[PDB]
């Protein structure tokens, strides 16, 4: 794959075989301050041009209605609380600008046994940390970012060994991400992006003691000084507060 050398990405050379087996209306309210336009096509100077190549190879022609804002959005530096339905194209929503900023502006040193993340993915299931997995490791091709995934109920002793084969986007569930810390196997003080997809659910199975521990008691980067985004179908009160904590003057995406 690509590697980061010297403060500058080198990506990888093209392999044609392989692409093969890799890549083969709804309304919305954009609310906050200073809220950019939204993008009608995927465009480099906007985005990095490796992953609007890697966008292309797999063929997609527009963005959908939470890429279009989430892009320019965070682009900008901003956080993002987004309020979107299933079919509004999430994954892309957060995959998208998270991968086209860590493909340019890189990941921070290490003191180089720990893994340390550039960019951190909180889902509520295995089946969904694993969806999102796939399609990073889809937009990863050729770049510096190598994708991990983690899950309860599984053995912890093989994502351990996936771990230390080194971990720059982690997809995780936030009990098995809290044990993996409690280890001291994950330092988050190089982590300059954090999703937590469908928070809602997260919450409605009692993760919001780990997911706090994980993110206000350990070593992440604090709030305002990295990019966080938020995605979650349903805000109630619960959800405001942890965006409240969470985010910093975030602009609310409200998707259907």
């Given at each position: 794959?690509?590697?980061?050398?010297?403060?500058?990405?080198?990506?990888?050379?093209?392999?044609?075989?392989?692409?093969?087996?890799?890549?083969?209306?709804?309304?919305?309210?954009?609310?906050?301050?200073?809220?950019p336009e939204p993008i009608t096509e995927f465009t480099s100077p906007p985005l990095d041009g490796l992953l609007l190549e890697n966008i292309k190879l797999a063929r997609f022609t527009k963005p959908?209605?939470?890429?279009?804002?989430?892009?320019?959005?965070?682009a900008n530096g901003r956080d993002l609380m987004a309020c979107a339905q299933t079919g509004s194209g999430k994954t892309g929503g957060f995959l998208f600008p998270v991968l086209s900023e860590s493909f340019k502006t890189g990941p921070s040193p290490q003191p180089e046994r720990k893994a340390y993340p550039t960019a951190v993915i909180?889902?509520?299931?295995?089946?969904?940390?694993?969806?999102?997995?796939?399609?990073?490791?889809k937009f990863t091709y050729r770049?510096?970012?190598?994708?991990?995934?983690?899950?309860?109920g599984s053995p912890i002793?093989?994502?351990?060994?996936?771990i230390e084969r080194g971990c720059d986007l982690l997809v995780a569930t936030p009990g098995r991400l809290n044990d993996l810390l409690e280890r001291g196997k994950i330092s988050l003080?190089?982590?300059?992006y954090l999703v937590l997809d469908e928070a809602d659910r997260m919450l409605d199975m009692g993760f919001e003691?780990?997911?706090?521990?994980?993110?206000?008691?350990?070593?992440?980067t604090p709030v305002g000084e990295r990019q966080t985004l938020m995605f979650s179908a349903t805000f109630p009160a619960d959800i405001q507060h942890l965006a409240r904590d969470?985010?910093?003057?975030?602009?609310?995406?409200?998707?259907?």
């Open positions: 794959g690509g590697r980061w050398i010297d403060g500058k990405h080198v990506p990888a050379p093209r392999n044609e075989k392989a692409e093969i087996a890799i890549f083969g209306d709804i309304p919305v309210d954009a609310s906050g301050k200073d809220v959908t209605p939470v890429q279009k804002y989430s892009v320019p959005i965070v909180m889902a509520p299931t295995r089946e969904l940390a694993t969806q999102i997995f796939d399609e990073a490791k770049s510096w970012v190598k994708a991990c995934v983690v899950y309860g002793g093989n994502q351990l060994r996936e003080a190089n982590v300059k003691p780990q997911i706090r521990h994980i993110v206000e008691d350990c070593d992440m969470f985010l910093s003057d975030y602009i609310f995406l409200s998707v259907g």
